């Protein structure tokens, strides 16, 4: 499948960094061939892909190949909405003339004049966060290339600023240091001012959503949790949680650093009540048993910033998953422990509980026979979050009670990367690693590669 070997392809970037051999040459001839038949398809999967799962080099580069396609005269309205849902940070634009810059293609007039209007239309101080002066294919490169007609008297002065920097006008140098100066960004106030009591309780106003989550620490350090002006501020900032763009382990690892550090109690009910409530909506119906694997070997930073081990990432994603879901969360190491039974503590209680005790060795098919197997389960759906290695013949029990039922499917997520990305193969999908956008990597697996085609269409074609 095409279509289907096009997604897998696409969505494996996110193990295999987001950007040649195998893959470039697969992933042009696959992308050629769908943007000529499919360019529907093509275009919800750079929507999905950017969006869904945050992928900036992949959908720059289906866009590239949209442009080159029989779609660009046949359905110029879809390229356009296209980008509109492709080009979403300052330099995304950039990443599409980078790709077509890679292949050896000329760059036509269609796509000039895409990336000039996009030029126009920025907001100016977003165009200048992302100059990617010392890039190749930077923002100069971009006005030098495609042209554009300033439609604006300030977006003249911003392409002349950009385009020679030191070498422009004062008249423009000015303007350029007024899209900084005027709605600054807390980073502004705590870069220009430095870090004291002072110039955080400054920044706090600008504070919202993931940025204050990540920034309590600050916060706490200058004392700012003790003052009560802050507290007031921090608990209006906190009534509107449910509206935060932010996954529910920013909020584990939150609460962690403030475990560590001894933050105030009350910070921390705040951060443990917005994880509470942190259950994404999801596609996915019907009771689910989650089996994590908490062997020692799980306990591994999930990457080299977060404060996070692996344990943690995966329990807390099944955990809030489960509650959505309904249905069971074992974990397994040397042995399966059942924490259904426990599932009404609080998820930061649950998830900290689990992870006091863990650790072991790893023996999947054991802990698969006590859980699913010898138990007779009767959901439809198995997730197992593992870091096993590789083994011959693998899963034969879960086969086995994959087809003692109906409809049912299995979904192995490997966080070290042994497995690849996969749809269903005998009833079980395959993940290559782990992600925080594995909620949505998981809804398009299990539709297959028969549904995958209509499903990213009928959800993500761009408007
Ligand atoms: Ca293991």
Redesign the pocket.
């Known amino acids: 499948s095409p279509h289907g070997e096009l997604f897998t392809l696409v969505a494996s970037s996110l193990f295999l960094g987001d950007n040649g051999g195998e893959r470039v040459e697969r992933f042009i001839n696959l992308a050629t061939t769908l943007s000529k038949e499919d360019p529907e398809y093509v275009a919800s999967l750079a929507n999905y892909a950017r969006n869904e799962l945050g992928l900036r080099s992949n959908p720059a580069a289906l866009v590239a190949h949209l442009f080159y396609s029989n779609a660009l005269e046949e359905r110029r309205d879809l390229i356009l909405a296209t980008t509109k849902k492709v080009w979403q940070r300052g330099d995304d634009h950039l990443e599409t003339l980078a790709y077509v810059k890679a292949v050896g293609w000329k760059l036509r007039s269609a796509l000039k004049k895409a990336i000039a209007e996009r030029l126009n239309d920025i907001p100016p101080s977003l165009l200048l966060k992302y100059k990617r002066a010392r890039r190749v294919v930077s923002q100069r490169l971009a006005i030098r290339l495609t042209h554009p007609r300033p439609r604006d008297e300030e977006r003249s002065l911003l392409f002349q600023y950009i385009v020679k920097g030191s070498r422009a006008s004062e008249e423009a140098k000015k303007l350029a240091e007024e899209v900084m100066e005027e709605r600054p960004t807390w980073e502004r106030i705590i870069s220009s001012k430095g870090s004291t009591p002072e110039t955080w309780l400054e920044a706090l106003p600008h504070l919202n959503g993931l940025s204050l989550v990540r920034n309590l620490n600050n916060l706490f350090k200058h004392g700012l949790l003790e003052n009560l002006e802050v507290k007031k501020t921090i608990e209006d900032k906190f009534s509107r949680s449910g509206s935060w763009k932010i996954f529910p382990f920013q909020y584990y690892s939150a609460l962690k650093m403030g475990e560590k550090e001894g933050w105030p109690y009350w910070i921390m009910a705040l951060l443990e009540e917005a994880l509470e409530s942190s259950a994404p909506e999801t596609r996915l119906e019907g009771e689910t048993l989650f089996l994590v ?6 306990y591994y930073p999930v990457s080299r910033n977060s404060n996070l081990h692996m344990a943690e990432a995966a329990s807390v994603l099944a955990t809030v998953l489960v509650k959505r879901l309904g249905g069971e969360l074992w974990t397994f ?1 040397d042995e399966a422990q059942d924490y259904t039974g426990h599932t009404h503590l609080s998820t930061y209680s649950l998830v900290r509980k689990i992870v006091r005790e863990g650790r072991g ?2 023996y ?1 098919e054991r802990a698969i026979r006590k859980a699913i197997l010898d138990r007779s389960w009767t959901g439809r759906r198995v997730v197992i979050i ?4 590789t083994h011959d013949m693998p899963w034969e029990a879960l086969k086995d009670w994959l087809r003692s039922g109906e409809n049912r499917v299995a979904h192995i997520i490997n966080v070290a990367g042994y497995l690849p990305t996969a749809f269903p193969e005998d009833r079980i999908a395959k993940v290559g690693g782990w992600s925080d956008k594995i909620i949505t990597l998981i809804e398009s697996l299990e539709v297959g590669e028969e549904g995958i085609r209509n499903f990213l269409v009928s959800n993500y074609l761009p408007p």
């Open positions: 694997d908490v062997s020692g070997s799980m190491a060795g790893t999947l593992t870091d096993e290695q």
